Curated annotation (Swiss-Prot), chains A, B:
Taxonomic classification: Eukaryota, Metazoa, Chordata, Craniata, Vertebrata
GO molecular-function terms, A-Z: actin filament binding; identical protein binding; protein heterodimerization activity; protein homodimerization activity; structural constituent of cytoskeleton
Miscellaneous comment text of the record: The sequences of cardiac and skeletal muscles are identical.
Role description: Binds to actin filaments in muscle and non-muscle cells. Plays a central role, in association with the troponin complex, in the calcium dependent regulation of vertebrate striated muscle contraction. Smooth muscle contraction is regulated by interaction with caldesmon. In non-muscle cells is implicated in stabilizing cytoskeleton actin filaments.
Gene: Tpm1
Listed transmembrane segments: none
Protein name stated in the entry: Tropomyosin alpha-1 chain
Length: 60, 60
């Protein structure tokens, strides 16, 4: 009766939470992806910077 | 009793849903923190290496 109506309410909250968790998982994973690619860029540009400044020293 | 067991088990399940959502969004937050700090790092490193390559070419 009303108890099964409560069941339906609980399960619809459940489904809403499932959609939410799917969105959150996608967001977190893509965020980690961006994180790793930017870390790679930072390391490589730091290496380029150091070699450039050493060459500048030699040139001076 | 089938309705009541569905009710209470789905209640524990929505509790699990909320807690896994919370940990997922916390992982999202820490990922965003890593992202923003490495964005700052990439920015400063790139601007520095640009200035340095400019200074090297001018010195040459």
């Amino acid at each position: 009766q009303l108890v099964e109506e409560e069941l339906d309410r609980a399960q619809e909250r459940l489904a809403t939470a499932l959609q939410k968790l799917e969105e959150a998982e996608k967001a977190a994973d893509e965020s980690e992806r961006g994180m790793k690619v930017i870390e790679s860029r930072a390391q490589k540009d730091e290496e380029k910077m150091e070699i450039q400044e050493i060459q500048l020293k030699e040139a001076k």
